[PDB]
């Protein structure tokens, strides 16, 4: 049921966010990133600023999920989902959601942080639409 899928997204989310303290101390990120992460799955929550996108990129890099251009490595992202309990179909669906969001969010501003935050907002909305967002 939707609760089982939510549990996969919870496991993914918690493991993804584990190194946030390390990222904050390495990059001098504002404490607003920690607030945005606490509220990441809260329905109707809007993110604070582009530094939350920088935090998402730092967490992605620590988990070796980014390519050299700071874009998601689709294969590594799929495998990350499977290691946290996604079946191959669910993992492929999650990567397709991120890919669709990235195609809707070209990096016109040469700002990987703001582009990443916009992709994350789009991904969050798609996950709520599927009732896959954990409380």
Numbering used by the authors: 24 to 158
Report text from the authors:
The apo-HarmPBP1 structure at pH 7.5 was determined by molecular replacement and refined to a resolution of 1.3 Å in the space group of P21, with an Rwork of 17.9% and an Rfree of 19.8%. The structure was built in the electron density map, except for the C-terminal residues 159-170. Although apo-HarmPBP1 adopts a common PBP scaffold of six α-helices surrounding a predominantly hydrophobic central pocket, the conformation is greatly distinct from other apo-PBPs. Surprisingly, the structural similarity between apo-HarmPBP1 and all other apo-GOBPs or apo-PBPs was lower as the RMSD was larger than 1.5 Å, revealing a distinct conformation of apo-HarmPBP1 compared with other apo-PBPs. The most significant structural differences between apo-HarmPBP1 and other known insect PBPs were observed at the C terminus. The last 12 residues were missed in the structure of apo-HarmPBP1, which might have been a result of crystal packing. However, the conformations of both termini as well as some loops differed significantly between apo-HarmPBP1 and the apo-BmorPBP/apo-ApolPBP1. The first helix of HarmPBP1 occupied the C-terminal helix position of the above two structures. In the apo-HarmPBP1, there was a channel through the ligand binding pocket. In the apo-HarmPBP1 structure, part of the Lys138 side chain was flexible. Moreover, the arrangements of both proteins in the crystal packing were different, revealing that the little structural difference was not caused by experimental errors.
